[PDB]
PDB file of C-alpha atoms in Angstrom:
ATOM      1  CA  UNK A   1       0.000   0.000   0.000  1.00  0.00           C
ATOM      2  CA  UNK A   2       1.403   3.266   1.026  1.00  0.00           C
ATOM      3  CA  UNK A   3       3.703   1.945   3.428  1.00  0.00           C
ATOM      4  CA  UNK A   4       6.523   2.149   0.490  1.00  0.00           C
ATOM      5  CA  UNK A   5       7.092   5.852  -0.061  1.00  0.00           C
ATOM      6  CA  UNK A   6       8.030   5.865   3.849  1.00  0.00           C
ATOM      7  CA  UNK A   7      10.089   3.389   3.015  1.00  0.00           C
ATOM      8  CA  UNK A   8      11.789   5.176   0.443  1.00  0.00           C
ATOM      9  CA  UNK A   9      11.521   8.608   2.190  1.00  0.00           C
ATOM     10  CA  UNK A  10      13.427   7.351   5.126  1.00  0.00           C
ATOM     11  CA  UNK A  11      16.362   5.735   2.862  1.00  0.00           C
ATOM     12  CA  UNK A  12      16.718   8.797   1.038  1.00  0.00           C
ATOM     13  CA  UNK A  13      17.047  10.346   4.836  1.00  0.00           C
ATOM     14  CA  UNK A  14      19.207   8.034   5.987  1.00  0.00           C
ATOM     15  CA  UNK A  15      21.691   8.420   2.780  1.00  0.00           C
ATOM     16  CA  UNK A  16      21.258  12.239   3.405  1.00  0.00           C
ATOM     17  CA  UNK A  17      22.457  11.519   7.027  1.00  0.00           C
ATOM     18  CA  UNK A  18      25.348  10.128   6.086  1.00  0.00           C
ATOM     19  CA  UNK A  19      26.465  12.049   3.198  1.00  0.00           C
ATOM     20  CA  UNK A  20      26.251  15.122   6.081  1.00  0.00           C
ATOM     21  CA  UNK A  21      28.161  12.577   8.280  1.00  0.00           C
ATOM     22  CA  UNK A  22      30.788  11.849   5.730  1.00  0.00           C
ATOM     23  CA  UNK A  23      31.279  15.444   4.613  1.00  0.00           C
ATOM     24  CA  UNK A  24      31.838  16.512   8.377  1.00  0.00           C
ATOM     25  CA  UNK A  25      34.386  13.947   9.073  1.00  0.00           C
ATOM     26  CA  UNK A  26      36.028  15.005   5.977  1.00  0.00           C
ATOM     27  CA  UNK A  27      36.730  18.392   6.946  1.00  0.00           C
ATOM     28  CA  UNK A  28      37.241  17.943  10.510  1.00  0.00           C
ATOM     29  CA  UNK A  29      40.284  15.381   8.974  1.00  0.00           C
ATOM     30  CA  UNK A  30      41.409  17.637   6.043  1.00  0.00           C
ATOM     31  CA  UNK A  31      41.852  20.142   9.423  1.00  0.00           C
ATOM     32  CA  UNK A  32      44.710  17.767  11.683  1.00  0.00           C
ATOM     33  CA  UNK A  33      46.493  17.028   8.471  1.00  0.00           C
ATOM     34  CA  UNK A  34      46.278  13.399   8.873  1.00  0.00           C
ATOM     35  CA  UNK A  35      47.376  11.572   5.846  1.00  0.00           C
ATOM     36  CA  UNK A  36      46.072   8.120   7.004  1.00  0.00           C
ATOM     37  CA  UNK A  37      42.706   8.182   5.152  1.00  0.00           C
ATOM     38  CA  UNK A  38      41.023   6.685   8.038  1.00  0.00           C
ATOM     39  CA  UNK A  39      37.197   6.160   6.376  1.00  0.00           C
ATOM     40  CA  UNK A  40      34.793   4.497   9.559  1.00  0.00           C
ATOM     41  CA  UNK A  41      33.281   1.158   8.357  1.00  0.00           C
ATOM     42  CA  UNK A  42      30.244   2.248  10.236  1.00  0.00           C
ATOM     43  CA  UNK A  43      29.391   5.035   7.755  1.00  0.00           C
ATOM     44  CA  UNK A  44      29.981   2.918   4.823  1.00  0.00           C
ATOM     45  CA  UNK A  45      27.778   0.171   6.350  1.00  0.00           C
ATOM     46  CA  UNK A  46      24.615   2.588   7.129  1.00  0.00           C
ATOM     47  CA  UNK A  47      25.159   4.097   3.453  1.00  0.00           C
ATOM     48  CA  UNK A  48      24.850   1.006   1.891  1.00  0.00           C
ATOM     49  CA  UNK A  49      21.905  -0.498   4.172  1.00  0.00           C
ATOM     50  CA  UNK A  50      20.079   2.847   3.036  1.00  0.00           C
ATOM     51  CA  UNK A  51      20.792   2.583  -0.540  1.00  0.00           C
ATOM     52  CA  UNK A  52      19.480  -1.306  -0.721  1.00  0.00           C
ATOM     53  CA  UNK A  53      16.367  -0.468   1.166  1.00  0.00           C
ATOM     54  CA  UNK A  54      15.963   2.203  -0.775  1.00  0.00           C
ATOM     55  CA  UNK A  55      16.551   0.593  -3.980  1.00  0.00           C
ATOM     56  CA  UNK A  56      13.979  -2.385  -3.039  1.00  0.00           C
ATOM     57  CA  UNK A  57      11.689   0.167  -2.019  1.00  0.00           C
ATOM     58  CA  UNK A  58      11.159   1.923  -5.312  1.00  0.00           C
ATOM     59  CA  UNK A  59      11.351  -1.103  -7.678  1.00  0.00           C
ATOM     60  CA  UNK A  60       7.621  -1.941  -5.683  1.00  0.00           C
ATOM     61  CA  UNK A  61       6.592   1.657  -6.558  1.00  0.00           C
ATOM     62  CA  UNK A  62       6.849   1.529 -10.214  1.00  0.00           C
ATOM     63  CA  UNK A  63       3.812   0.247 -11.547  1.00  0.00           C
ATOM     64  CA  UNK A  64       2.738  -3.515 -12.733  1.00  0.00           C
ATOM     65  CA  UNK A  65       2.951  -5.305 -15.640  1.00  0.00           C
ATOM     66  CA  UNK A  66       0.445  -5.887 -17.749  1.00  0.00           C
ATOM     67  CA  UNK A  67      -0.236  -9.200 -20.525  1.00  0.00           C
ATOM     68  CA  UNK A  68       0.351  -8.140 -24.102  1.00  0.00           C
ATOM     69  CA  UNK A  69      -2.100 -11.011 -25.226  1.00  0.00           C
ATOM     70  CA  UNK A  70      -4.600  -8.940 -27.051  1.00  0.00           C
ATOM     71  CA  UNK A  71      -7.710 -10.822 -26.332  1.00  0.00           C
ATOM     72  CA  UNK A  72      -6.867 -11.176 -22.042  1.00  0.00           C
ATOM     73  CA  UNK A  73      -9.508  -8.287 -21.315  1.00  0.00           C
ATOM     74  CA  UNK A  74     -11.987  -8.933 -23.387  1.00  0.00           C
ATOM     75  CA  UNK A  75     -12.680 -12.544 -21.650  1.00  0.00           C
ATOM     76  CA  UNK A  76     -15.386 -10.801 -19.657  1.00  0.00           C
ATOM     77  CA  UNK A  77     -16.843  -8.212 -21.661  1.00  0.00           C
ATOM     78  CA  UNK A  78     -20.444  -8.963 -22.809  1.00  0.00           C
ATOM     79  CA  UNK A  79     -22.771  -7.799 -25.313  1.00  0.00           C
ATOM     80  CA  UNK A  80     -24.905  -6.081 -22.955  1.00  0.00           C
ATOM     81  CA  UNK A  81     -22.208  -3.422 -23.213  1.00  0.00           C
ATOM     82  CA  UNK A  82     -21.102  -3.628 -26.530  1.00  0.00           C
ATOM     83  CA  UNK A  83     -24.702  -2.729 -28.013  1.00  0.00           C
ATOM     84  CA  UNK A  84     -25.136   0.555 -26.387  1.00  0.00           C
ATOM     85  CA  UNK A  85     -24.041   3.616 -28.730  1.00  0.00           C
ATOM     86  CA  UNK A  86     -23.982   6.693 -26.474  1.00  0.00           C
ATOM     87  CA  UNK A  87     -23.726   8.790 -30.066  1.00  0.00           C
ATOM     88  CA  UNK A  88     -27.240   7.316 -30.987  1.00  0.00           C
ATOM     89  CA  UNK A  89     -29.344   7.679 -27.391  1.00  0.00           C
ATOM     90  CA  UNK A  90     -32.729   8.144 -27.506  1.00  0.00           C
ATOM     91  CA  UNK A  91     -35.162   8.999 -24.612  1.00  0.00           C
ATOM     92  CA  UNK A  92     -38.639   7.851 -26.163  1.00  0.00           C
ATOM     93  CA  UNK A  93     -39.297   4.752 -24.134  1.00  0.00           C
ATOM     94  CA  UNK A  94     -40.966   3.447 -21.195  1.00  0.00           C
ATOM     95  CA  UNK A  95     -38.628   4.305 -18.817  1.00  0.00           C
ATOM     96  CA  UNK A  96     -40.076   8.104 -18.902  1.00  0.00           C
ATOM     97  CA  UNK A  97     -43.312   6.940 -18.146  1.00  0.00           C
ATOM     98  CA  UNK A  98     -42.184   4.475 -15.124  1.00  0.00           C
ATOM     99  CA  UNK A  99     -40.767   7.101 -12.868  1.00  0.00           C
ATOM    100  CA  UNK A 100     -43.014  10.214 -12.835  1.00  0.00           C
ATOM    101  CA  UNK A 101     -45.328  10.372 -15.967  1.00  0.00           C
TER     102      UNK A 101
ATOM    103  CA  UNK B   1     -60.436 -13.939 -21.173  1.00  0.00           C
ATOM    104  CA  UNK B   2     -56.960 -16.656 -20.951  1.00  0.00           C
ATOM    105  CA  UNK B   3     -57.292 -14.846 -16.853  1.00  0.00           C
ATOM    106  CA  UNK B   4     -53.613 -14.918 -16.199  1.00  0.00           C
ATOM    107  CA  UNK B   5     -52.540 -15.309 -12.881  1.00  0.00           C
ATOM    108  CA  UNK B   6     -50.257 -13.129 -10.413  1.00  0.00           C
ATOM    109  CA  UNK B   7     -46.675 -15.002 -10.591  1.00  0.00           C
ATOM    110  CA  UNK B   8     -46.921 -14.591 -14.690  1.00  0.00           C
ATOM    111  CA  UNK B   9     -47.930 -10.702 -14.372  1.00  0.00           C
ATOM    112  CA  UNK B  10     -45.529  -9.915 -11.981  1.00  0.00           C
ATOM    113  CA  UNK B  11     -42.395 -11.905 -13.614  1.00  0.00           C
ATOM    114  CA  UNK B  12     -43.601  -9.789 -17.064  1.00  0.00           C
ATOM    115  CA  UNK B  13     -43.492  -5.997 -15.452  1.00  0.00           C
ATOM    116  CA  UNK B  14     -40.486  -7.303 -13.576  1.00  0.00           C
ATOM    117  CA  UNK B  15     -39.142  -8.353 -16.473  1.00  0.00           C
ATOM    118  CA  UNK B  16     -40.442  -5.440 -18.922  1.00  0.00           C
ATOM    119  CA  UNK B  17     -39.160  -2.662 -16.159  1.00  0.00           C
ATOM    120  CA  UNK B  18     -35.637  -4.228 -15.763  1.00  0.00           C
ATOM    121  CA  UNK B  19     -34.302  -2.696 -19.118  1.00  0.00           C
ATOM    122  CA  UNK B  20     -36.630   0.409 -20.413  1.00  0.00           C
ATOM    123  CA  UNK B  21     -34.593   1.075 -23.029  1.00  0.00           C
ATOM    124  CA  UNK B  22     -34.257  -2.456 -25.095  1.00  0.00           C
ATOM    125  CA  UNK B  23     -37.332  -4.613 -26.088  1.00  0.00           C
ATOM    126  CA  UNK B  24     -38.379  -7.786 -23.932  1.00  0.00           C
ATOM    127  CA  UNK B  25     -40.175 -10.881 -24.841  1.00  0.00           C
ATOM    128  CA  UNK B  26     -40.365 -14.478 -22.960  1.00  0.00           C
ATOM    129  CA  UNK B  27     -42.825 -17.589 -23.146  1.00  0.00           C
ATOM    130  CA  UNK B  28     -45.909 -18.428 -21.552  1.00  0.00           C
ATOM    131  CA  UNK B  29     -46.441 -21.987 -19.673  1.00  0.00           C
ATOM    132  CA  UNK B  30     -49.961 -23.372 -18.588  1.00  0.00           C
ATOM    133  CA  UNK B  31     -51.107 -26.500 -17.041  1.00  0.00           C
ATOM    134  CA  UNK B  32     -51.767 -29.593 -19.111  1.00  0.00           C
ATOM    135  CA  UNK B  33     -61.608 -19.141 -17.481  1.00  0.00           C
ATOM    136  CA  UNK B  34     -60.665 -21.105 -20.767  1.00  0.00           C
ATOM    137  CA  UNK B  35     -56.750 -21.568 -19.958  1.00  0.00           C
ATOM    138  CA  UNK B  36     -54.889 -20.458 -16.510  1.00  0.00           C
ATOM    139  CA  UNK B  37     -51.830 -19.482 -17.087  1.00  0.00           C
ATOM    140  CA  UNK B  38     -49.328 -20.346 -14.252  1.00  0.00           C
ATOM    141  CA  UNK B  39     -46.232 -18.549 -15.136  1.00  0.00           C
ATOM    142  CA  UNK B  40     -43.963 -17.076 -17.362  1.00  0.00           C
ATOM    143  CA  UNK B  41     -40.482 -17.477 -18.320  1.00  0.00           C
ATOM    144  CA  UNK B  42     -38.568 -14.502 -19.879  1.00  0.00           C
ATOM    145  CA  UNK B  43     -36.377 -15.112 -22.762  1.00  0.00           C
ATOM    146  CA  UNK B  44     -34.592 -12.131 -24.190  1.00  0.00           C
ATOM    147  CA  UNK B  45     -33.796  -8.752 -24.430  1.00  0.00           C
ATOM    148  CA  UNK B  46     -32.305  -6.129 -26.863  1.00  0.00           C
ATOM    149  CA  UNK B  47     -32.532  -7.840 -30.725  1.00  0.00           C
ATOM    150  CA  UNK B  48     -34.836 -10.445 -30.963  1.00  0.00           C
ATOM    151  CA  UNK B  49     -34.637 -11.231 -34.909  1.00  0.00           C
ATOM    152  CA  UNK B  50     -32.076 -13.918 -34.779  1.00  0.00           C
ATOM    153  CA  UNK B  51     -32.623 -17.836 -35.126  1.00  0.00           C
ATOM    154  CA  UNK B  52     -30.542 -20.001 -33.281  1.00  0.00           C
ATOM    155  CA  UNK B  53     -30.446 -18.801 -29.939  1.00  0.00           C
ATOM    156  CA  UNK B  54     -34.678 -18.717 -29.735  1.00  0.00           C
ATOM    157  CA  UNK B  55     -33.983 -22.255 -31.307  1.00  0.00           C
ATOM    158  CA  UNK B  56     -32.108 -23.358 -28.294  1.00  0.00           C
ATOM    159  CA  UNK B  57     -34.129 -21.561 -25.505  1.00  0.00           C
ATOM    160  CA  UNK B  58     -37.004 -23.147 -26.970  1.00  0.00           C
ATOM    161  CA  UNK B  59     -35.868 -26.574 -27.000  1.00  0.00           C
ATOM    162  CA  UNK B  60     -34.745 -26.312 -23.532  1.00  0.00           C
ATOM    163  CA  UNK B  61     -37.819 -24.669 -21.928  1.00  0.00           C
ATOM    164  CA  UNK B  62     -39.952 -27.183 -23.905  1.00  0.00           C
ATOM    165  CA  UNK B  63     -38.345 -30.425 -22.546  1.00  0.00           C
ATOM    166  CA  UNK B  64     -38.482 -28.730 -18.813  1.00  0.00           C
ATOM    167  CA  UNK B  65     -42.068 -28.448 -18.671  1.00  0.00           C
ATOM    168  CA  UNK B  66     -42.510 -31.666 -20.380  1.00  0.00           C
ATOM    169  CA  UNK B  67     -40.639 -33.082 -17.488  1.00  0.00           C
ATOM    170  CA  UNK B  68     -42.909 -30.984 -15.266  1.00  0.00           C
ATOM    171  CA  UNK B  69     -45.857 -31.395 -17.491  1.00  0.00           C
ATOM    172  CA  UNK B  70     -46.632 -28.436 -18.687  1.00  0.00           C
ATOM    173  CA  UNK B  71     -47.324 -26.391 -22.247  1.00  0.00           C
ATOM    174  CA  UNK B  72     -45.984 -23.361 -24.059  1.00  0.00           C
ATOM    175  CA  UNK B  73     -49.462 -21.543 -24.499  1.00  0.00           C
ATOM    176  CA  UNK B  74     -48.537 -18.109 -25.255  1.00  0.00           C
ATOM    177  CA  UNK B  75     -45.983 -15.258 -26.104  1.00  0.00           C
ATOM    178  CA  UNK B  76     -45.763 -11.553 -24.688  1.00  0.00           C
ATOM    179  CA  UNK B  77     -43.374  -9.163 -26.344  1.00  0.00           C
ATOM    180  CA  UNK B  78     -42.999  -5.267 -25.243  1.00  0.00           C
ATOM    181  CA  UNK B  79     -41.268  -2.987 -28.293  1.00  0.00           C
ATOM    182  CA  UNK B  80     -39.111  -0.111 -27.895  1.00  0.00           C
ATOM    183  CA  UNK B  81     -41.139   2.719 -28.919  1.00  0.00           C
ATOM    184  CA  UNK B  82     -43.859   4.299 -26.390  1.00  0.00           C
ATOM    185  CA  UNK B  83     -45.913   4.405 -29.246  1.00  0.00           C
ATOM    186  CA  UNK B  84     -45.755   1.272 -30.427  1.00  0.00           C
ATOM    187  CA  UNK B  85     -48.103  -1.437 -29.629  1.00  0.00           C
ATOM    188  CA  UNK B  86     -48.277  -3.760 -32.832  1.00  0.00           C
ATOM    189  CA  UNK B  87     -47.090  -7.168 -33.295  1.00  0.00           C
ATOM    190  CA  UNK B  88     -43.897  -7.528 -35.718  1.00  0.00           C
ATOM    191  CA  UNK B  89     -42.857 -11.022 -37.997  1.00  0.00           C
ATOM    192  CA  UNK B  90     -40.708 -12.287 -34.970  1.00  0.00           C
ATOM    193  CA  UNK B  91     -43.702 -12.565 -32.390  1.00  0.00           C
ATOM    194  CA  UNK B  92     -46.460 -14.075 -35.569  1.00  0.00           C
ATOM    195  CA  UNK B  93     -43.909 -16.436 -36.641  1.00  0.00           C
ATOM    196  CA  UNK B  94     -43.194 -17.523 -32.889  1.00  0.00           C
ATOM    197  CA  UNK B  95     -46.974 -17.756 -32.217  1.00  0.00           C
ATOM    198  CA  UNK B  96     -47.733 -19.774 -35.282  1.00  0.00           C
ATOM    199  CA  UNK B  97     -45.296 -21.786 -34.281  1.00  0.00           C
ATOM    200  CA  UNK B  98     -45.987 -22.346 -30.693  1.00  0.00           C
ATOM    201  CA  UNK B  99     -50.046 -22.835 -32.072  1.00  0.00           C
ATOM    202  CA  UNK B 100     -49.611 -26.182 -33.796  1.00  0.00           C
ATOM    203  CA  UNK B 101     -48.620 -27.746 -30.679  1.00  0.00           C
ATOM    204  CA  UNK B 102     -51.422 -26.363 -28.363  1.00  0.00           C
ATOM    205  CA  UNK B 103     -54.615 -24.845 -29.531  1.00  0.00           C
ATOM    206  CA  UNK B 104     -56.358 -20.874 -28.721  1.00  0.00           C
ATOM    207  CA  UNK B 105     -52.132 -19.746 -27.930  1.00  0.00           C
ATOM    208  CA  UNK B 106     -52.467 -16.407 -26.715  1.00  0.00           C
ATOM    209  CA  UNK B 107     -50.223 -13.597 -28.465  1.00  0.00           C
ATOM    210  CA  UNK B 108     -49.626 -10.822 -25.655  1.00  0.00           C
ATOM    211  CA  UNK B 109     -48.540  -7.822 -26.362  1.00  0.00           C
ATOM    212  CA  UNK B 110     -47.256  -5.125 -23.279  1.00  0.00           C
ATOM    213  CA  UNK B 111     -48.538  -1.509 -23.589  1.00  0.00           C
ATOM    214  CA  UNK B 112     -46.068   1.336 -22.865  1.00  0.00           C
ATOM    215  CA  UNK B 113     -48.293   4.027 -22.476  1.00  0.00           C
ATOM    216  CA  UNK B 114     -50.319   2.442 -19.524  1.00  0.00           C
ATOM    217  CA  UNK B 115     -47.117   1.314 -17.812  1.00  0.00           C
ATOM    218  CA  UNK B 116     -47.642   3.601 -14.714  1.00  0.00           C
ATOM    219  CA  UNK B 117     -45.862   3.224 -11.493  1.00  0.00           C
ATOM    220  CA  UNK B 118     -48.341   1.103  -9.495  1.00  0.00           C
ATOM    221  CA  UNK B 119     -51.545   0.691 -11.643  1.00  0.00           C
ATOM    222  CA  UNK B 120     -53.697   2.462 -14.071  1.00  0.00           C
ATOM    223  CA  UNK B 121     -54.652  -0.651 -16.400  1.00  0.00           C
ATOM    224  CA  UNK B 122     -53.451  -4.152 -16.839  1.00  0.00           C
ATOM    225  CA  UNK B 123     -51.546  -2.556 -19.877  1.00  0.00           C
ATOM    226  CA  UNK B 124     -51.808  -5.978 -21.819  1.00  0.00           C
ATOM    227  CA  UNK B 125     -53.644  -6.413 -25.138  1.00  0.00           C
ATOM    228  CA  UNK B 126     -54.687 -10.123 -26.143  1.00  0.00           C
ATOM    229  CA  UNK B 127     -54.345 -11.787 -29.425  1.00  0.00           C
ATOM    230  CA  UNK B 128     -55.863 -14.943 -30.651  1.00  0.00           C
ATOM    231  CA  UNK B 129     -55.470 -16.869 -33.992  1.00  0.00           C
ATOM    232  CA  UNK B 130     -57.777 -16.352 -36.556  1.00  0.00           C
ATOM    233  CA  UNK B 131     -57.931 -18.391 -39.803  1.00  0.00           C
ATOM    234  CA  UNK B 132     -54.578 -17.443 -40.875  1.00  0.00           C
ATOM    235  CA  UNK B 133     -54.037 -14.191 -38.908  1.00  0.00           C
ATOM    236  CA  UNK B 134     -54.470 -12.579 -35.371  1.00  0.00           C
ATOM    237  CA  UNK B 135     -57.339 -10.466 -33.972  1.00  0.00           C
ATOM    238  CA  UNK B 136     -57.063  -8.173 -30.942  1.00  0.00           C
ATOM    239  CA  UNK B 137     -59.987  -9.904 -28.584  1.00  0.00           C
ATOM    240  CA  UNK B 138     -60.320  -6.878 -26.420  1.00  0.00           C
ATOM    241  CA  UNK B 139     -64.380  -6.406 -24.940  1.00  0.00           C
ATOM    242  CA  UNK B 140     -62.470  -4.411 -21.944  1.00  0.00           C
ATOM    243  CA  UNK B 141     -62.100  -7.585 -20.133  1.00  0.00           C
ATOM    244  CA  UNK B 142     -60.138  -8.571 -16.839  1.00  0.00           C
ATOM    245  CA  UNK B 143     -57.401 -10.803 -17.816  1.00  0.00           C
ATOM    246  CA  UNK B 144     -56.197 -11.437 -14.285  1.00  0.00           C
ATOM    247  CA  UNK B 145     -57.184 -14.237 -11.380  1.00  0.00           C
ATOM    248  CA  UNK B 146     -58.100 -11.370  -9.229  1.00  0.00           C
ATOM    249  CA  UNK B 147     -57.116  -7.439 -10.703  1.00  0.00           C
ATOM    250  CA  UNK B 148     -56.914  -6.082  -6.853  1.00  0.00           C
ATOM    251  CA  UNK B 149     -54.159  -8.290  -5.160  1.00  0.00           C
ATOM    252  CA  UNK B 150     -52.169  -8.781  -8.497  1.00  0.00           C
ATOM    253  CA  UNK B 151     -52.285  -5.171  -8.846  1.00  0.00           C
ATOM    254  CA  UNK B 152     -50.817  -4.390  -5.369  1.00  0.00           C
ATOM    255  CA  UNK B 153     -48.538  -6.949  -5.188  1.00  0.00           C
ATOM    256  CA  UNK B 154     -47.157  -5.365  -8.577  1.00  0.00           C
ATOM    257  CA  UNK B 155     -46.640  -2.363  -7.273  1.00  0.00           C
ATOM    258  CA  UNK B 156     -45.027  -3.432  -4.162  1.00  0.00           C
ATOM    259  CA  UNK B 157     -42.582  -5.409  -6.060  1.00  0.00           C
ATOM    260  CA  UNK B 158     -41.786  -2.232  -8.278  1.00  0.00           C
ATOM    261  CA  UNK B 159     -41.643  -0.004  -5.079  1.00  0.00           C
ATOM    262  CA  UNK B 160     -39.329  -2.350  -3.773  1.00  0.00           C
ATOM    263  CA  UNK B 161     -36.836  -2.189  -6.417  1.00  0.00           C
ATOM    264  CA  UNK B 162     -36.616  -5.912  -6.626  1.00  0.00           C
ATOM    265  CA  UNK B 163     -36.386  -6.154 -10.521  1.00  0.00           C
ATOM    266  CA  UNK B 164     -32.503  -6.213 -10.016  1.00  0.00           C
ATOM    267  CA  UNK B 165     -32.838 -10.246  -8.567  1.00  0.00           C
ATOM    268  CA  UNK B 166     -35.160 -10.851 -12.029  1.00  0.00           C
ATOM    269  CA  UNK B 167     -32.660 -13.486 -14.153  1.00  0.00           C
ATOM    270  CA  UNK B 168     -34.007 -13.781 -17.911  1.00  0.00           C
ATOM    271  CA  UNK B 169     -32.195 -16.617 -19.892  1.00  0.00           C
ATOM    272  CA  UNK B 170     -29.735 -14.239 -21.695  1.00  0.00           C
ATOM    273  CA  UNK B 171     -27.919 -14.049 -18.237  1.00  0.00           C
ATOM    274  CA  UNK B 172     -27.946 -17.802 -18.078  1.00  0.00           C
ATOM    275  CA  UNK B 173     -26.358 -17.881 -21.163  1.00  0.00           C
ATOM    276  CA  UNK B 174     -23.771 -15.065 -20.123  1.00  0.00           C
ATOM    277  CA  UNK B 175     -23.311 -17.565 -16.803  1.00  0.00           C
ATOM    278  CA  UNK B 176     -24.385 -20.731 -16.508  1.00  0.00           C
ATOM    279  CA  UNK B 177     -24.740 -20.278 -12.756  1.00  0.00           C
ATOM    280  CA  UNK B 178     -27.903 -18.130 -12.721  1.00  0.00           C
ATOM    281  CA  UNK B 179     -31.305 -20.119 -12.925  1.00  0.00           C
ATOM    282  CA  UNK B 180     -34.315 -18.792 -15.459  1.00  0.00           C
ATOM    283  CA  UNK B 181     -37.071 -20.070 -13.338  1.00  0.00           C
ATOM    284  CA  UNK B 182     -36.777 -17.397 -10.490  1.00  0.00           C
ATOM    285  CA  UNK B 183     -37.168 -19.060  -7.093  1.00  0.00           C
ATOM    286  CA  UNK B 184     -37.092 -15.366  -5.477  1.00  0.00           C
ATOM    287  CA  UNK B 185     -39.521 -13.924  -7.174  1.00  0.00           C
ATOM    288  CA  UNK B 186     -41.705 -16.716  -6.148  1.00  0.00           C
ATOM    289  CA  UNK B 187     -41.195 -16.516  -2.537  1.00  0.00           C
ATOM    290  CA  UNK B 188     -41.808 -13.068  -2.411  1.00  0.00           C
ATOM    291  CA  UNK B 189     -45.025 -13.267  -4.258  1.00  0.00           C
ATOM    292  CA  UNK B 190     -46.023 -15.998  -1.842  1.00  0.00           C
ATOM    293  CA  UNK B 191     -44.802 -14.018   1.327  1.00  0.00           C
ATOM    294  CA  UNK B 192     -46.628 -10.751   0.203  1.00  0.00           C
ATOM    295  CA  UNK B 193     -49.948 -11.828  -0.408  1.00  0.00           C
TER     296      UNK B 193
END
């Protein structure tokens, strides 16, 4: 139902989070001057969580498929509603005189 | 007078008020005044000037009441037009056809203009065989077992809205599941008395 754009919303969050996260520990690193290029595994761990869920999240949102077999809807139309021409309606009938003469 | 009974009239407004717009007929069955009617069976709506399916319909209502010994003894048939009360090829060659198998058939015809909400008239004109054609045998007579009740009951079943239950044999044929012979329509005649 609609339970999967919350799903979505709060992966794109999350990946928001951590591209703040990442960008802050970058410049509080680019400010000791440490040549190490210490990058935390728990950043890239929450990154990719939110980019999976968010991933399976929107291939559910995309629409469904639908048979190209030409003759799959048309195995219960009737005639009832294939006789009726709304171009050539007329009103001179009984039903007039039914309801309210 | 033929002095139909309630079940038949009711089934054949039912019947005639579930689809204004389109044109209605069915069959008549009687028991093996001159010949009570018991009830009716309605056969189609929309076009009626095709063969095989009439064929078919026929066949299979005929063996039913031979198994429940009845007879086909007449045919009603309701046009399109409000002013339009005359019988057509279809319903003559249908009548002559149902008349060499039962004598006096009746040909019934349904009048729009007198198809008020509750009652006016019994909005039916009678036709009997002639020689070789059919004459309107209309002295202003009462075909009905009893105009008052019939006439109510009508009109309670209209009020009601209870023409959407009403299953003709064109919605048998569109699913095999429904059943021509109307059990509901009975019970509720019987139960409002």
């Amino acid at each position: 139902p609609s339970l999967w754009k919350g799903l979505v919303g709060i992966g794109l969050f999350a990946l928001a989070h951590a591209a703040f996260s990442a960008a802050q520990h970058r410049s509080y690193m680019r400010l000791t001057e440490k040549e190490d290029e210490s990058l935390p595994i728990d950043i890239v761990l929450q990154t990719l969580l939110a980019f999976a869920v968010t991933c399976y999240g929107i291939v559910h949102i995309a629409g469904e498929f639908k048979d190209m077999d030409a003759t799959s809807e048309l195995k219960n139309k009737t005639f009832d509603t294939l006789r009726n021409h709304p171009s050539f309606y007329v009103f001179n009938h009984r039903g007039r005189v039914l309801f309210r003469p | 007078g033929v002095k139909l009974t309630t079940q038949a009239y009711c089934k054949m407004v039912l019947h005639g008020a579930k689809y204004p717009h389109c044109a209605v007929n069915g069959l008549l069955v009687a028991e093996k005044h001159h010949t009570l009617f018991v009830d009716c069976i309605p056969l189609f709506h929309g076009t009626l000037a095709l063969a095989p399916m009439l064929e078919v319909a026929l066949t299979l209502i005929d063996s039913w009441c031979k198994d429940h010994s009845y007879v086909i003894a007449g045919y009603y048939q309701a046009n399109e037009r409000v002013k339009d009360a005359s019988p057509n090829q279809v319903a003559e060659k249908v009548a002559s056809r149902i008349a060499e198998g039962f004598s006096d058939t009746a040909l019934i015809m349904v009048d729009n203009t007198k198809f008020t909400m509750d009652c006016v008239a019994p909005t039916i004109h009678v036709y009997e065989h002639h020689e070789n054609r059919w004459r309107c045998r209309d002295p202003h007579h009462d075909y009905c077992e009893d105009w008052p009740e019939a006439q109510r009951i009508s009109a309670s079943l209209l009020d009601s809205r209870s023409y959407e239950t009403l299953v003709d044999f064109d919605n048998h044929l569109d699913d095999i599941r429904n059943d021509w012979t109307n059990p509901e329509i009975n019970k509720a005649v019987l139960h409002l008395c």
